[PDB]
Amino acid sequence: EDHLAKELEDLNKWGLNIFNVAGYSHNRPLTCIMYAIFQERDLLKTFRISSDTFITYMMTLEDHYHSDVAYHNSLHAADVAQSTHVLLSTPALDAVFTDLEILAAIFAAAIHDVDHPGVSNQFLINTNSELALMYNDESVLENHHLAVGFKLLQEEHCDIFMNLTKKQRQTLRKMVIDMVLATDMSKHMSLLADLKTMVETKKVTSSGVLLLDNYTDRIQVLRNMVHCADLSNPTKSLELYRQWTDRIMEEFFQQGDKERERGMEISPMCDKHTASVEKSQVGFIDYIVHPLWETWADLVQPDAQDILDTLEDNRNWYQSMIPCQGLMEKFQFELTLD
Ligand SMILES: CCCOc1cc([C@]2(C)CNC(=O)O2)ccc1OC
Ligand SMILES: [Mg+2]
Ligand SMILES: [Zn+2]
């Protein structure tokens, strides 16, 4: 409507407010934002994707996110997709990616948490869930999000990639699988170590645009971009970030209650009777989010300085509400329990 079009004026900006978009699109923010993004980048035209087919696919995908899960619902997918859309346009990456690579990253972002049950991989492993048995304890959720997303493409009434070439579909699938598997937090430290090595050997044109030799380097940047998007809540305005924190803590605490009910050990940051919300965000920023974004900022300097400055301000706010490599691994364990 009127308010929706006003909010969508910020489609290409980090300050877009996805909560507002959700409110004005009958709780279909993913459908909404993906249609706005694809139209903005001319992807429907480029890849001969019919609008009806695209909407049907996106609505079905959206409906496969659980509305009763506090954080990992379709609003988080919409946020990651829109954040990825903004990251693909950072000046340091101008003309670096093919249309297929752009399509793959945004698609990956959209499907990356589909059918998430609101409990972690480790909870699924420890309770001997059907999903963990299916996936042999390895990136259980992420393998599942991919399987759902790709399973939905089988059916003409939903095959948005019908008009890509066979080679194109194969390359896209390879790329998307790579990106979604990279959202598994248990791989955070390795992704970061690999991204630091990339910053070290960074090469540019005389214009300040990154030079990426072949597929290996391109997919490495894209994996990290989606991971950054997934870890982007603390880099947004404080008003937005605080809502994301309320949501993750509601989801985590519900997992902790489930753990308590079943007599399992309570994961510390999922224990509502002990965990400090504020300290947890400070630690999340210090040992996970800032190290990653500091490295991303190095890769694309100076394009991400504003984000780094917002990150610092947000950290100081959470710290004010409280009355290195070793702790990097510690916080990765607290989240994953791996
Ligand atoms: C509570 C400390 C961790 O906080 C967050 C974690 C996460 C993710 C990346 C999602 N699940 C999780 O384990 O880490 C997202 C947002 C968070 O805060 C807004
Ligand atoms: Mg995930
Ligand atoms: Zn996610």
Nearest CA, atom 13, ligand 1: 335
Type of residue numbered 6 = K
Type of residue numbered 144 = H
Question: For residue 243, what is the domain's CATH number?
Answer: 1.10.1300.10
d(CA 43, CA 102): 9
Nearest to 85 by CA among 181, 163, 14, 188: 14
Cα pseudo-dihedral 62, 67, 70, 73, rounded to 10: -10
- Beta bridge partners of residue 285, listed in sequence order: none
Q: Which helix (H) or strand (E) holds 276?
A: none
Nearest CA, atom 1, ligand 1: 280
| Residue 17: other Cβ atoms inside 10 A | 17
Per the CB < 8 A criterion, the answer to whether 40 and 11 are in contact is yes
- Phi, psi for residue 210 in degrees, rounded to 5: -60, 140
DSSP class of residue 288 equals I
Distance (Å) from CA 241 to ligand 3 centroid:
15
| 331 appears as a binding residue in the annotation | no
DSSP class of residue 270 equals G
- The total number of structural domains in the chain stands at 1
d(CA 121, CA 139): 7
With b for 16 or more beta-carbon neighbours within 10 A and e for fewer, the 131-169 pattern comes to bbeebeeebbbbbbbbbbbeebbeeeebbbbeebeeebb
Q: Which helix (H) or strand (E) holds 4?
A: helix 2-7
Structural domain range at position 187: 1-338
Per the CB < 8 A criterion, the answer to whether 255 and 270 are in contact is yes
Q: How many residues does the chain have?
A: 338
Closest ligand by atom to 110 CA? 3
Closest ligand by atom to 119 CA? 1
DSSP class of residue 265 equals P
- Phi, psi for residue 263 in degrees, rounded to 5: 65, 20
Q: Give the Å distances, CA to CA, from 310 to 91, 237, 267.
A: 19, 7, 30
Residue labelled with tokens 């087919």 = 53
Per the CB < 8 A criterion, the answer to whether 255 and 119 are in contact is yes
Distance (Å) from CA 248 to ligand 1 centroid:
6
- Phi, psi for residue 119 in degrees, rounded to 5: -135, 155
Residue labelled with tokens 């490599």 = 325
Question: Which of 3, 64, 66, 72 is the catalytic position?
Answer: 72
Closest ligand by atom to 70 CA? 1
d(CA 331, CA 114): 25
Q: With helix as H, strand as E and coil as C, how does 133-190 read?
A: HHCCCCCHHHHHHHHHHHHHHCCHHHCCCCCCCHHHHHHHHHHHHHHHHCCCHHHHHH
Per the CB < 8 A criterion, the answer to whether 96 and 218 are in contact is yes
Nearest to 228 by CA among 288, 177, 140: 288
d(CA 276, CA 67): 26
| 213 appears as a binding residue in the annotation | no
| 99 appears as a binding residue in the annotation | no
DSSP class of residue 111 equals H
Q: Which residues line ligand 1 (CB under 6 A)?
A: 185, 231, 233, 244-245, 248, 269, 280-281, 284, 335
Q: Which two tokens mark 67?
A: 């509305």
Distance (Å) from CA 59 to ligand 1 centroid:
26
Nearest CA, atom 10, ligand 1: 248
Rg (CA), the chain: 19
d(CA 110, CA 150): 12
| 112 appears as a binding residue in the annotation | yes
Catalytic residue status for 145: no
Per the CB < 8 A criterion, the answer to whether 186 and 332 are in contact is yes
Cα 85 from chain centroid? Answer: 11
CA end-to-end distance (rounded Å), the chain: 46
DSSP 58-98: HHHHHHTS-TTSSSSSHHHHHHHHHHHHHHTT-GGGTTTS-
Long-range contacts of 121-127 (CB under 8 A, 24+ apart): 121/184, 121/186, 121/336, 121/338, 122/267, 122/336, 122/337, 122/338, 123/255, 123/258, 123/259, 123/267, 126/264, 127/262, 127/264
d(CA 272, CA 305): 35
Residue to substitute in 122, 226, 335 for testing ligand 1 pocket (most ligand atoms within 8 angstroms of CB): 335
Residue to substitute in 141, 244, 248, 288 for testing ligand 1 pocket (most ligand atoms within 8 angstroms of CB): 248
Nearest to 58 by CA among 22, 34, 83, 84: 34
Per the CB < 8 A criterion, the answer to whether 118 and 101 are in contact is no
